[PDB]
């Protein structure tokens, strides 16, 4: 949907042979709490043999952007399973928030590599602190000094079926 970023913290159920098991944390992007918590359990299944029935969720907490009005260059690290194997990817996303960058990347995977939200693994998302460290030209093209571009051929949305003037694609 429109994403949120969660931390989900869990552990195996305590035992006589082990009180206070290790606490494990993942940062998870999902639409809501329930999807995020299931996401946690799936990844925790894969990482090491912890069953959902054998453990618990010790916390779940939404993570917000520290500066949700500062445009960042994001470096996103992705593995996935479409359509005939598995892959690594690295996408630059110039954007404002981590959740918006992640939603943009999920839309990009659906658009190009034809992969669903269950097929995509977000490995690490990082604000590129230094503009010299951006590697993709399609993001590095907006970083140049005194950037200006027009929006040629404006199409005016018309609420009326008929118009009495030939429309103009000006400014």
């Amino acid at each position: 949907a429109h994403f949120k970023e969660y931390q989900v913290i869990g552990r195996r159920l305590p035992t006589e042979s082990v009180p206070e098991p290790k606490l494990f944390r993942m940062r998870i992007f999902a639409s809501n709490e329930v999807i995020a918590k299931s996401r946690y359990w799936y990844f925790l299944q894969k990482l090491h043999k912890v069953k959902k029935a054998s453990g618990e969720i010790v916390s779940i907490n939404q993570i917000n952007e520290a500066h949700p009005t500062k445009v960042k260059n994001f470096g996103v690290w992705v593995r996935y399973d479409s359509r005939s194997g598995t892959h690594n990817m690295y996408k630059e996303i110039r954007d404002v928030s981590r959740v918006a960058a992640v939603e943009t990347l999920y839309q990009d995977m659906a658009a190009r590599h034809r992969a669903r939200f269950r097929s995509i693994h977000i490995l690490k998302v990082a604000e590129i602190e230094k503009t010299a460290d951006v590697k993709r030209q399609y993001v590095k093209q907006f970083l140049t000094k005194d950037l200006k571009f027009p929006l040629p051929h404006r199409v005016q949305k018309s609420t009326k079926t008929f118009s009495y003037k030939r429309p103009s694609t000006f400014y």
Binding site: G75, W77, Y90, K124, A126, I128, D133, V134, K135
Partner: peptide, 25 residues
């Protein structure tokens, strides 16, 4: 092509000590 390769590499190489530091008393 990830930019922070060396940083995460060093971080996880520091985390290889725990798999052998603690297990024996």
């Amino acid at each position: 092509n990830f930019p922070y390769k060396a940083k995460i590499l060093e971080e996880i190489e520091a985390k290889k000590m725990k798999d052998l530091e603690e297990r024996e008393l």
